[PDB]
Amino acid sequence: KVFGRCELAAAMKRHGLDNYRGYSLGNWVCAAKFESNFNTQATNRNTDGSTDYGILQINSRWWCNDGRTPGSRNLCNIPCSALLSSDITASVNCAKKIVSDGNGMNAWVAWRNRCKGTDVQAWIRGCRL
Numbered sequence: 832k833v834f835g836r837c838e839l840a841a842a843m844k845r846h847g848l849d850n851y852r853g854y855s856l857g858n859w860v861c862a863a864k865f866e867s868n869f870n871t872q873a874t875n876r877n878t879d880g881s882t883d884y885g886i887l888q889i890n891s892r893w894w895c896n897d898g899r900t901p902g903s904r905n906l907c908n909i910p911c912s913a914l915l916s917s918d919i920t921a922s923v924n925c926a927k928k929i930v931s932d933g934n935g936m937n938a939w940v941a942w943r944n945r946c947k948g949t950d951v952q953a954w955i956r957g958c959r960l
């Protein structure tokens with residue numbers, strides 16, 4: 832599923848991501864924009880052989896099981912495929928664990944490089960929330 836900007840902001844808010852660990856909703860929408868262009872089916876293969884999955888490009892090295900990332904963990908206790916669902920519940924629940932891990936949203940290299948410090952409220956501007 833390719834979400835609309837305000838459609839995703841609403842789904843993220845409903846699942847309690849708005850101000851989670853102090854990150855305003857526009858931070859999460861900005862990260863999703865640059866990670867996946869709001870596409871739940873986004874995938875990216877890493878040089879190390881891990882894969883990133885879903886709207887927030889959650890990686891198989893730590894967070895999900897894909898059966899093909901030697902040495903990896905599955906700390907969100909999900910198949911990585913769950914992160915490609917039209918239903919963002921698994922992605923949001925796992926994102927909550929990741930952003931709690933010590934480095935906040937720096938865990939998402941695209942958030943640090945493209946969202947951090949910018950006017951992220953622009954990502955929810957005009958949305959009925």
Ligand code: NA
Nearest residue numbers: 891895903904
């Ligand atoms: Na894994």
